[PDB]
Amino acid sequence: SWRHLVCYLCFYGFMAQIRPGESFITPYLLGPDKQFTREQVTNEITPVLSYSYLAVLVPVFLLTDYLRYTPVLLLQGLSFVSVWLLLLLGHSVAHMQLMELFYSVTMAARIAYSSYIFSLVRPARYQRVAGYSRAAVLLGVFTSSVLGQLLVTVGRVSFSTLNYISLAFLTFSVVLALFLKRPKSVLARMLRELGDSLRRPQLRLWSLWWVFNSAGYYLVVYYVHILWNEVRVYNFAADAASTLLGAITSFAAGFVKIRWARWSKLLIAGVTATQAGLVFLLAHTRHPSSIWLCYAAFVLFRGSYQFLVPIATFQIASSLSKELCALVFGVNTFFATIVKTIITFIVSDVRGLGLPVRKQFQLYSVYFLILSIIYFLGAMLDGLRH
């Protein structure tokens, strides 16, 4: 129980994140294999992903707490395998929509991995496991992305070979998940315990941070691609550097020894202010011969977010019950998604306060600044009442 538990958990987190062809799904659909039109992919496929994610997060976090997290991790792996099988053996648009449902199912089961790494270790080791596994996962993503780009830049393999490699890696990840140790009204009980746990201050603070900062981080990450496109290899370089720095910062977060009873709100306020500054750097840096500054700003922003995430998960779990952690994570993620949607309704789409990408990033920076000011006020209130 000494080596294999944590080492194999980190190894599975790394390998389950290896999908070289996941960054080239869109071109593969538009390439000379699927022959899908651009409208078809943009309208009938990705909105399916978003809607299915929103409708699938709820059962996932309602059930992963009960069935233990190993079945849900196996389900995530099998859904990734099904996604690539549909990619390699799907001609109609309905097959691709089913693939997007399965991809949303995969995206909804990360809370299972987090709560699983948390349920296998003594609470005194909550932080380090939070720092290690997350880092590994991010490292995996890094490797995945890099691998894909390398296999399409230095190598001459087609998208079909890349998808076959991704399917083989997904099968290996499923085999790895098969050997994971399974830990050893009901809904009314769970809701009452959730409320009682939310009465605790640390859980409130870190769940609020999750809900109102993961949404902003996902908005910035998703919209920075089109922000840079509006103004190729450099895009991948920035993405890979940000992922690697995120893994490094999660690893570092595993090792920090900050007194969280008093210096938790301050830390969140400072990091959120830094993220607001970095988003403003991403937005207002319109000088064409300055893209290194924009890339550095994005890399540092992702590094800060992936530094704060393991701390958030560890402090949420340490102030929770046994069969609650996954549920809480899911709810936060669920709420985060909703928040993001709300913002992406009021800033980009459905008329609303419609603005270009630069103005959207300015509003995201102002949103992060508002959060930072709110958290600074909270820290001042905590200090004044002490």
Ligand X SMILES: Nc1nc(N)c2nc(CNc3ccc(C(=O)N[C@@H](CCCNC(=O)c4ccccc4C(=O)O)C(=O)O)cc3)cnc2n1
Per this entry, what is the length of the chain? 386
315 appears as a binding residue in the annotation: no
110 appears as a binding residue in the annotation: yes
**Least Å from the CB of residue 103 to ligand X:** 5
CB 16 within 8 A of CB 173: yes
**Least Å from the CB of residue 304 to ligand X:** 13
Q: How far is CA 97 from CA 49, 270, 304, 342, in A?
A: 8, 42, 34, 24
CB within 8 A of 202, min separation 6: which ones?
A: 260, 264, 315, 316, 318, 319
CB 210 within 8 A of CB 110: no
141 appears as a binding residue in the annotation: yes
Q: Residue 152 and residue 160: Cα distance in Å, rounded?
A: 11
Return residues touching ligand X (CB under 6 A).
17, 22, 25-26, 29, 41, 45-46, 49, 100, 103, 107, 110, 113-114, 134, 137, 141, 221
243 appears as a binding residue in the annotation: no
32 appears as a binding residue in the annotation: no
SS3 assignment, position 263: coil
Q: Residue 321 and residue 382: Cα distance in Å, rounded?
A: 25
CB 340 within 8 A of CB 213: no
322 appears as a binding residue in the annotation: yes
Q: Residue 378 and residue 130: Cα distance in Å, rounded?
A: 26
What tokens were used for 87?
């990619």
Burial category of 268 from C-beta neighbours within 10 Å (exposed 0-12, middle 13-18, buried 19 and up) = buried
66 appears as a binding residue in the annotation: no
Greatest extent of the chain over all pairs of C-alpha atoms, in Å: 66
Q: Residue 152 and residue 345: Cα distance in Å, rounded?
A: 36
CB 126 within 8 A of CB 253: no
Q: How far is CA 140 from CA 13, 137, 299, in A?
A: 7, 5, 17
313 appears as a binding residue in the annotation: yes
134 appears as a binding residue in the annotation: yes
SS3 assignment, position 119: helix
Which residues are known binding-site members for folate?
25-26, 100, 110, 141, 217-218, 222, 302, 306
Which residues are known binding-site members for 2',3'-cGAMP?
110-111, 114, 126, 134, 218, 250, 306, 310, 313, 322, 325, 329
